[PDB]
Structures are given as C-alpha cells and as structure tokens.
Design a protein around this motif. Structure first.
Motif, PDB file in Angstrom:
ATOM      1  N   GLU A 239       0.788  -1.223   0.000  1.00 15.63           N
ATOM      2  CA  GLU A 239       0.000   0.000   0.000  1.00 15.63           C
ATOM      3  C   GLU A 239       0.824   1.279   0.000  1.00 15.63           C
ATOM      4  O   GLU A 239       0.234   2.363  -0.022  1.00 15.63           O
ATOM      5  N   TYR A 240       2.153   1.200   0.021  1.00 16.92           N
ATOM      6  CA  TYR A 240       2.997   2.378   0.168  1.00 16.92           C
ATOM      7  C   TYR A 240       3.592   2.860  -1.148  1.00 16.92           C
ATOM      8  O   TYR A 240       4.454   3.742  -1.135  1.00 16.92           O
ATOM      9  N   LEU A 241       3.160   2.310  -2.279  1.00 18.18           N
ATOM     10  CA  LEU A 241       3.671   2.732  -3.576  1.00 18.18           C
ATOM     11  C   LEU A 241       2.604   3.374  -4.446  1.00 18.18           C
ATOM     12  O   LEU A 241       2.845   4.436  -5.031  1.00 18.18           O
ATOM     13  N   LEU A 242       1.428   2.763  -4.550  1.00 15.10           N
ATOM     14  CA  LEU A 242       0.362   3.275  -5.396  1.00 15.10           C
ATOM     15  C   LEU A 242      -0.966   3.133  -4.670  1.00 15.10           C
ATOM     16  O   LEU A 242      -1.109   2.332  -3.744  1.00 15.10           O
ATOM     17  N   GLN A 243      -1.942   3.927  -5.102  1.00 18.33           N
ATOM     18  CA  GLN A 243      -3.279   3.830  -4.537  1.00 18.33           C
ATOM     19  C   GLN A 243      -3.860   2.446  -4.794  1.00 18.33           C
ATOM     20  O   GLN A 243      -3.705   1.879  -5.878  1.00 18.33           O
ATOM     21  N   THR A 244      -4.530   1.899  -3.785  1.00 18.76           N
ATOM     22  CA  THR A 244      -5.108   0.571  -3.905  1.00 18.76           C
ATOM     23  C   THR A 244      -6.470   0.637  -4.589  1.00 18.76           C
ATOM     24  O   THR A 244      -7.130   1.678  -4.628  1.00 18.76           O
ATOM     25  N   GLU A 245      -6.890  -0.507  -5.134  1.00 18.85           N
ATOM     26  CA  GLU A 245      -8.158  -0.573  -5.851  1.00 18.85           C
ATOM     27  C   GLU A 245      -9.349  -0.278  -4.948  1.00 18.85           C
ATOM     28  O   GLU A 245     -10.414   0.098  -5.449  1.00 18.85           O
ATOM     29  N   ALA A 246      -9.194  -0.428  -3.633  1.00 21.62           N
ATOM     30  CA  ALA A 246     -10.273  -0.194  -2.684  1.00 21.62           C
ATOM     31  C   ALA A 246     -10.202   1.188  -2.044  1.00 21.62           C
ATOM     32  O   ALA A 246     -10.737   1.384  -0.947  1.00 21.62           O
TER      33      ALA A 246
END
Lengths: 574, 220
Positions: A225-232
């Motif tokens: 979760e610390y690189l790109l926005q998550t799908e949720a």
C-alpha cells in the motif's frame, strides 16, 4: 469576551488542582455550553492558566427540590418556558469540573500544574480564542530562564477537534511538527484497523522525504500500500506523492512481479515513470548462492517435531569448505538439478575429471548414471523443490547485498534512498529474507560506529509479530538502534501485545480508537498523560481522529483531525 | 555543550587518571585532540577491547549461542548442551580438546606455547598431526565456523586481555590507591557488550573477595 459562568469552589485533587464552575439560567438560555475535553482560559490574580473540562453533572442550587418542582409542572400540564418562568429560573443550573494543566510563560515556555490554589472570588473562566489556541499548541517544556531555539521549518500535521460535535472543530488551529522528531527515534501508531493508519504513515513519510533528503527508508510493505493507490481507495501512494513533489531517482521497489507492477506504474505515473521508481527483482540464481538454498531448506516450517535434519545441518556449515572440491560441489549442483532448478545455458560440472553439461539433457543423464557429506544432499534432493518459486536462472544479483549497498554504502553516502520491499510477492520466504536482511543491516551499522551514523528509518507493519521475541533482531533494533542512528515506525493495533520495555522507550505516539480495556490500560500504564483521554478512546469510534503525543517536552496529549495526503501535497507546492 | 568528564578533569588539572577502553581508538583519538588540545595524552589513555577465547571459552560459546536464535531460532542440541555443560567439560581434557580444536579450526590465532593433552597447537606442524588424530564436544568440533564472527574481537596473549588489564587497573598490588577512572565504550562492542560486562563484573568481584583482609577494593 465575558466569563462563562461563576466559580464556586476549588481544591487540590491528587496531583492536580481543580475548580467547580456553575452555568446559570442566563448562560444556559443564551446557548452557552462547555464540551468535555475542551480547553479554556482561567484568570486568577492577574495570571492565565490552561484548564480542561473533565466533568459535568446536575446539582440543586440553594434550597430547592428540582424533582418535585419538575414533576408537579409535568403533572399540572404547566409549560415552564412560556408559562411561569420564575420556577424555571430556580432549577436551570449546571455544574462542571475544570482541571488546571499549567500556564504559558516567558517566550512560549510551559510551566506545568501549579502550587497556588485560587480563591473562589478571584477565579474566572473564559472561552479561549483561536490565536490563544494557536499560541498554546506551540508551547513546550524547556529549561527555565532560557530562550527558544526557533529556526527549522515546520509543517501542518492536523487541526484541533473535540470529537464529532458541531462547533467543536477548529480548521485554523493547526499543529505544526518538526520532522526531526521522527529521525532516529521510535514512533508507535496504535488503533483499530481502517481508522487512518495508512494516511498518517504516508503523511509522515512524505514530510520526512521532503524535509530530510539525506535520510533513507526501508519500508517492509506487507499490505502492498505504500507505492500506489489501492483498488479499494483513491489515496495516493509514495510514488505519486514524489511525482507531485518533483523528487526523482529515490524509490527502489523490490518485487518478484516486475511486469505487473510496471504495468500499474505506467498507467498511474505516465510514460516517464522510470524517473521516479526503479523496479528490481526479488529472485536469485541458486546455482550462484547454494548457501542461500541450504539456509532456506534448513529454516523451513518444521511441522510438528522441531528437529532440523542432520544432513542439512552438516551441509549448512560445511558447504563453504566443500566449494574447494569439484567432487563435493558436483553433488550439490546435481541435488539442485534433480530438485528441478533450471540452470544457465552452458553450465558445466566436473564430476571425477571430465566435463559434463548439466544444461544438456543427455549430459545430465550421463552424469546421473555416473553418480563425505555432499552425497546425502543428492540422496535427499526433493527437499529443494519448494525453492523453484524463488529461482531465476542467470541473475547473480543478491538483492540482499544490493539493498545493503543502497542503504549503507560509501558511494551512496547521504543522498537518501527509499527502498520498498514487496513482501507478499516472496511467498513463504518473506520472513527468512526479512530477518536475514535486518541482521545484515544491523551488523553493518555497528561496523560504521565511530565514523558515521546509519541514518535510515525502518517502516514495519504488524509489529507484534516481530517485537514479541526478546531474542530477535527486530527487538534488538527497537532497543538499541538509537545508538547507531536507526529509527523505527511501527503499527500494531494492539498495544497490549507490544512488550512494556519497548513501550516505555518509545518517543512518539499516535493513538486512534481502541476497543480493548487491556489496550487502554497498557497505554495509561506506559504514559500517564494518556489518562485524560482513555475514556474517549474506548467509547468513540471516529475515523481519522487521532491523539498525538511527542516526547519529551510536550505538555499534554493533543486531539487532531490529521490532514489528508492530498491536502498536504496541494499545500507543499505553494 | 555540557562538559564531559575528560574535559572536567582537564579543567581541574587532574592528570594520568582516565583509562578509556574502546574498539575505535582512531576515531576517539581524533575527537580527543579536537576537544582537549594537542596535550590530550596527559589526561586520557585509549586502549583496545580485545580478548582471548582460549582462556575464556565460555564467552565464545555464549556469544555463538546468542548469534544463533537471533538469525532465526532453535539453537542446535550440541550448542545448547555446551552452553550449560562447558564448566563440567573443563575438567575432562578429552572433551576440552575438542572445544580448543574447534576454535583453532575456526581460525583464532593462539599464543605461542599453548598445548593440549588430547601437542603444540600454536606450532604449524603439530596441529596437523593432532587434527588428523581427531559426543557433544565431538559434534561441536565439526561445526567450527560458528565461531568465525569471534575474529571481530579476538586477540592472543594476556597483555591484550582487557579483562585482565582492567582487573589490575582497579585492584593491582602496585597500583594501590591514587584511584583510576576506567570508562568502557560499550556501543563499539555491538552484541557482546552485555556478556563482556557480566564477565568483567564477576571477575572483579571474585578478585575483591580474594583480597579481603589485606586491602579494600575501594571503587565505584
């Protein structure tokens, strides 16, 4: 700009001075109220104190029988408001309890508590203004008769709030933090799951990256979760924050799914993403590192009986000696080949004195038919099969050594580096690799003692799985890393699981809603100042609402709405 | 900018009393010159923190045991047995020789004149004969690399042994009175600091108990 009520009593309750305030019918009818946990100003003898509202209760004033009066009015169908205000004027009172935290003196110093108890006719209570709140949130404990240091820039971290009540939020009363509080120290991020942990951590990491370009980070991304926005969700990650801020060539992302991650990075960062993130593999060629394979197979699950195999034990130590004998190394290479690890193109062994090409099937068969400790490994070859998921022919990389060089190398001295490890892509070897890398980095940091400091921050998730073992490398790092310039930021959601020795030595605390009395008890036992908010923490599940406490010179715990990463990024470019 | 103890001694004019044991003598002598001037050698003596494992093999075994269970878990059966029963092994030369050979194979240089009664282990030729000539100790013999990391802080002899040097500094027959301020640089020792400190304290207490009736230990 007038007193809120009338002070009718004061005393010393335990370690704190308190007073009793009464709100009369005039204040109550004009809509004047006090919130629990609100900060007010107290004037007594030409001096101003900070007070906090701790309690509220209803008590009769004078010689009255409020129950009988109200019951009679209800029975007789009498409306007290419109009709008969004289009986309504004798019951409409309210009581509050206010504790004196201290006062602000000199150039922003905080003098805690008080040795002087105010007489009743002297004290008065005032609603605090926005400027007074701003000046009060910046006060710090300091040596008497000195001058504030001042200087280094500060950034907004959140704004004052008193729950979810209307009129209890102050968007203009922000708390500004010096990011140097986070370098070399210990930060704890407590609270239930889904209440703001990720946003808080991302804001802290972005502030550190912006303020200290020479401090590196080692993020063990367990949740990815610390690189790109998550799908949720749609909250940006570190890569997008760095793209917005204009920081290039600092993020090194180690994963075993480079194609998928580069696919996502393309769509989220454009066609130029190679200037912001550098993707590297988490796969090794076990023909170059047979010791890694031996250690992996030796340190496996060991279901039921915890007896490591004797042949594997012997190999683990004597493989380094075996490397000087082709007759012994051929058995190790054959063991890997029989387990099923595809070799390079043109890999050649020398069993007795002749050349064999294990890369070619017929040569492999010839050597197999042609076939001091190396023979046992070949006999028990299948024990290496699970290694295939981590195998990559022709790599010779050793991401462990690469990361050690990135974080502590002489050439890469200063200049910072954010090493993000995609742990979930390593399957069942993630724990082994994490422990080995942490011990390697600690050894190198101890080596550098007396010459320079490590100067990097370890970002650890679900810290209760790693800090419980008191003989472990992560406990050792949490306990001794400050001597070598290594910080730690850990999130657990269960303080009662963290050892009290680690809890008592942490500097920064960010606490969200906790649903366990055990957690609240351990929090108050570790830090006394958290005793004023323990009741709110248990009963108020509010998302994005945090209690912050930075040591050692913060007077009291502060409740905040933490700023979103979007707002922080939007305000950092101005 | 609160003055350190060496700077306080310089201000007060106290000379030849501070002995600073460290593993970074160069780094510390570079700071000492900067802060105390060119005459800093009149107030502090910088010394190394190296020890000999042929005379304190309990430290070797304990350090190896700690070095395991920190890079994983489950110390081996032989290592766990040795950690507890090395003291009993110390009275059986047959079992002691295996530990000594394990250290020698690991590669810790011994002192000239050291022999075992399985032999001049120091001599480059008798070692081959003994090794070719040769239980928990036997098992520990083969796994000789568990002591490799000890080479970080190994040194043969007795003048090198800081444990002995501090013992005479604080309880020497010649150095009676006049005081000595011994300061240890614990961080430079890394993971062995606690074991070294415990061993030093035990040694000093034993010596002080031995000296009772003749003179007082008289230190803080």
């Amino acid at each position: 700009e007038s007193p809120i009520g009338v002070v009718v009593s004061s005393r010393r309750n335990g370690p704190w001075a308190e007073l009793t305030l009464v709100l009369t019918p005039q204040e109550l009818d004009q809509g004047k109220r006090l919130l629990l946990g609100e900060l007010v100003r107290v004037s007594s003898g030409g001096k101003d104190y900070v007070g906090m509202v701790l309690d509220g209760y209803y008590e009769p004033v004078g010689r009255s029988d409020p129950t009988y009066t109200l019951a009679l009015a209800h029975i007789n169908q009498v409306d007290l408001e419109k009709e008969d205000p004289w009986a309504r004027k004798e019951v409409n009172f309210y009581h509050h309890r206010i504790v004196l935290l201290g006062r602000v003196v000199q150039g922003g110093l905080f003098a805690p508590s008080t040795r002087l108890l105010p007489p009743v006719v002297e004290a008065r209570v005032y609603r605090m203004t926005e400027e007074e709140l701003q000046r009060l949130l910046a006060a710090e404990v300091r040596t008497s008769g000195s001058v504030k240091a001042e200087g280094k820039r500060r950034y907004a971290f959140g704004h004052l709030a008193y729950g979810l009540e209307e009129g209890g939020e102050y968007p203009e009363v922000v708390k500004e933090v010096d990011p140097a509080l986070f370098v070399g120290r210990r930060t704890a991020n407590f609270g239930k799951t889904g209440f703001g942990k990720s946003n808080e951590n991302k804001v802290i990491l972005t502030l550190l990256a912006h303020a200290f370009p020479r401090v590196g980070m080692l993020i063990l991304d367990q949740n990815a979760e610390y690189l790109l926005q998550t799908e949720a969700t749609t909250s940006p990650g570190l890569a997008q924050a760095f793209k917005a801020l204009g920081i290039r060539g600092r993020i090194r992302f180690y994963t075993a799914r480079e194609e998928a991650w580069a696919r996502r990075l393309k769509e989220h960062l454009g066609t130029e993403w190679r200037e912001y993130v550098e993707v590297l593999p988490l796969k090794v060629d076990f023909y170059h590192f047979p010791e890694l394979a031996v250690a992996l197979a030796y340190q496996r699950r060991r279901l039921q009986g915890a007896e490591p195999p004797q042949y594997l034990e012997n190999a683990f130590y004597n493989l380094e000696d075996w490397k000087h004998i082709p007759d012994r190394m051929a058995y190790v290479y054959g063991a890997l080949r029989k387990a099923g690890l595809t070799p390079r193109k043109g890999l050649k062994i020398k069993y007795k004195n002749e050349n064999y090409d294990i890369s070619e099937e017929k040569s492999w068969g010839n050597l197999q038919e042609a076939m001091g400790g190396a023979r046992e490994l070949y006999s028990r070859a299948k024990v290496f099969s699970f290694l295939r998921a981590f195998h990559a022919p022709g790599k010779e990389a050793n991401f462990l050594e690469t990361i050690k060089e990135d974080l502590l190398g002489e050439k890469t001295e200063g200049e910072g580096k954010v090493v993000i490890l995609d742990l979930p892509s390593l399957g069942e070897a993630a724990d082994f690799f994490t422990l080995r890398l942490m011990d390697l980095l600690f050894d190198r940091a101890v080596e550098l003692y007396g010459k320079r400091q490590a100067n990097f921050l370890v970002v650890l998730e679900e810290a209760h799985n790693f800090l419980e073992d008191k003989a472990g490398i992560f406990y050792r790092v949490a306990k001794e890393g400050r001597k070598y310039g290594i910080g730690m930021l850990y999130s657990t959601q269960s303080p009662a699981s963290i050892p009290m020795e680690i809890l008592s030595q942490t500097e920064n605390f960010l606490v969200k809603h906790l649903s366990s009395e055990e957690d609240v008890k351990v929090l108050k036992r570790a830090k006394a100042p958290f005793a004023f908010v323990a009741d709110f923490l248990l009963s108020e599940p509010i998302i994005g609402y945090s209690y912050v406490y930075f040591e050692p010179y913060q007077p009291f715990v502060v409740p905040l709405r933490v700023k979103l990463l979007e707002h922080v990024l939007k305000s950092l470019d101005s």
